[PDB]
Design a protein around this motif. Structure first.
Motif, PDB file in Angstrom:
ATOM      1  N   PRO A 184      19.282 -26.057  46.145  1.00 33.24           N
ATOM      2  CA  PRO A 184      18.088 -25.751  47.196  1.00 33.24           C
ATOM      3  C   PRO A 184      17.784 -24.303  47.315  1.00 33.24           C
ATOM      4  N   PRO A 185      16.350 -24.009  47.843  1.00 28.96           N
ATOM      5  CA  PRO A 185      16.227 -22.597  48.350  1.00 28.96           C
ATOM      6  C   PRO A 185      17.192 -22.164  49.262  1.00 28.96           C
ATOM      7  N   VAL A 186      17.508 -20.642  48.778  1.00 28.31           N
ATOM      8  CA  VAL A 186      18.599 -20.193  49.789  1.00 28.31           C
ATOM      9  C   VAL A 186      18.176 -18.713  50.429  1.00 28.31           C
ATOM     10  N   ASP A 187      18.994 -18.528  51.328  1.00 23.19           N
ATOM     11  CA  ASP A 187      18.766 -17.064  52.085  1.00 23.19           C
ATOM     12  C   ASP A 187      20.241 -16.721  52.312  1.00 23.19           C
ATOM     13  N   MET A 188      20.455 -15.438  51.882  1.00 24.04           N
ATOM     14  CA  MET A 188      21.781 -14.663  51.780  1.00 24.04           C
ATOM     15  C   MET A 188      21.568 -13.402  52.717  1.00 24.04           C
ATOM     16  N   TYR A 189      22.498 -13.146  53.693  1.00 20.34           N
ATOM     17  CA  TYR A 189      22.476 -12.063  54.519  1.00 20.34           C
ATOM     18  C   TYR A 189      23.954 -11.783  55.100  1.00 20.34           C
ATOM     19  N   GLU A 190      24.094 -10.728  55.528  1.00 27.69           N
ATOM     20  CA  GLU A 190      25.224 -10.386  56.290  1.00 27.69           C
ATOM     21  C   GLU A 190      25.101  -9.897  57.593  1.00 27.69           C
ATOM     22  N   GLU A 191      25.505 -10.650  58.705  1.00 28.08           N
ATOM     23  CA  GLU A 191      25.493  -9.984  60.051  1.00 28.08           C
ATOM     24  C   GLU A 191      27.119 -10.105  60.649  1.00 28.08           C
ATOM     25  N   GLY A 192      27.221  -9.526  61.463  1.00 34.37           N
ATOM     26  CA  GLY A 192      28.660  -9.431  62.048  1.00 34.37           C
ATOM     27  C   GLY A 192      29.788  -9.508  61.321  1.00 34.37           C
ATOM     28  N   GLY A 193      29.943  -8.712  60.236  1.00 30.32           N
ATOM     29  CA  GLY A 193      30.871  -8.734  59.366  1.00 30.32           C
ATOM     30  C   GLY A 193      31.153 -10.155  58.656  1.00 30.32           C
TER      31      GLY A 193
END
Lengths: 5, 111, 105, 5
Positions: free
Chosen positions: B21-30
């Motif tokens: 699948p298409p994917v988003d990867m991000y960091e928030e709030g540790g």
């Protein structure tokens, strides 16, 4: 395997 | 790349099986958050695990039975996406996963 | 291995569509996850074209490393049967799957 | 035009 809720 | 010149009919389940699948990867709030568009699977068939310390592996299998005359066949029966994480995941890390509206959301603790 | 495609790339191939005919119906199935049902606009235009359009707000606070999921969707589907202009077309959306059943005359 | 239920 990660538990998918 | 530049399979963009093909027409839709010529794009097969095999193609999408490579890139889905298409994917988003991000960091928030540790938290390392991996968001995937994985529509139309059974949540008890979605297999996600971190192999090594670095790699989220998203595997999923579904049965597709479409009787009649075929015209377009693009949707993947199988998925096996490998994503290299920018964070070292502890072996004992508590990883959550939710499958809602066809979206798989994986939260990985880092901080 | 891990080669990440551009969001712009996914944009040109999103979503994957299955189209087939059974029982006098053209059944169109698309993996279209993470959208609001009221923001999915599908219609048959001029007897031979099914147009699927969708928009969504992608809110992801923090630092992005990978972004592949498109915000806009538009897919024109060559239709084989130049379906009737008049009949009732069904449209369901569940588990991210958009299923559209078009009657043939 | 098509109602998505």
């Amino acid at each position: 395997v990660i538990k998918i809720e | 790349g530049k399979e963009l010149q093909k027409r839709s009919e010529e794009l097969s389940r095999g193609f999408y099986e490579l890139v889905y699948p298409p994917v988003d990867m991000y960091e928030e709030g540790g938290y390392l958050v991996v968001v995937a568009d994985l529509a139309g699977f059974n949540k008890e068939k979605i297999k996600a695990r971190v192999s090594g310390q670095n790699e989220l592996i998203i595997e999923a299998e579904r049965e597709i039975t479409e009787p009649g005359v075929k015209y377009l066949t693009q949707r993947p029966k199988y998925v096996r996406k490998v994503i290299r994480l920018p964070y070292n995941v502890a072996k004992d890390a508590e990883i959550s996963g939710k499958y809602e509206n066809g979206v798989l959301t994986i939260r990985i603790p880092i901080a």
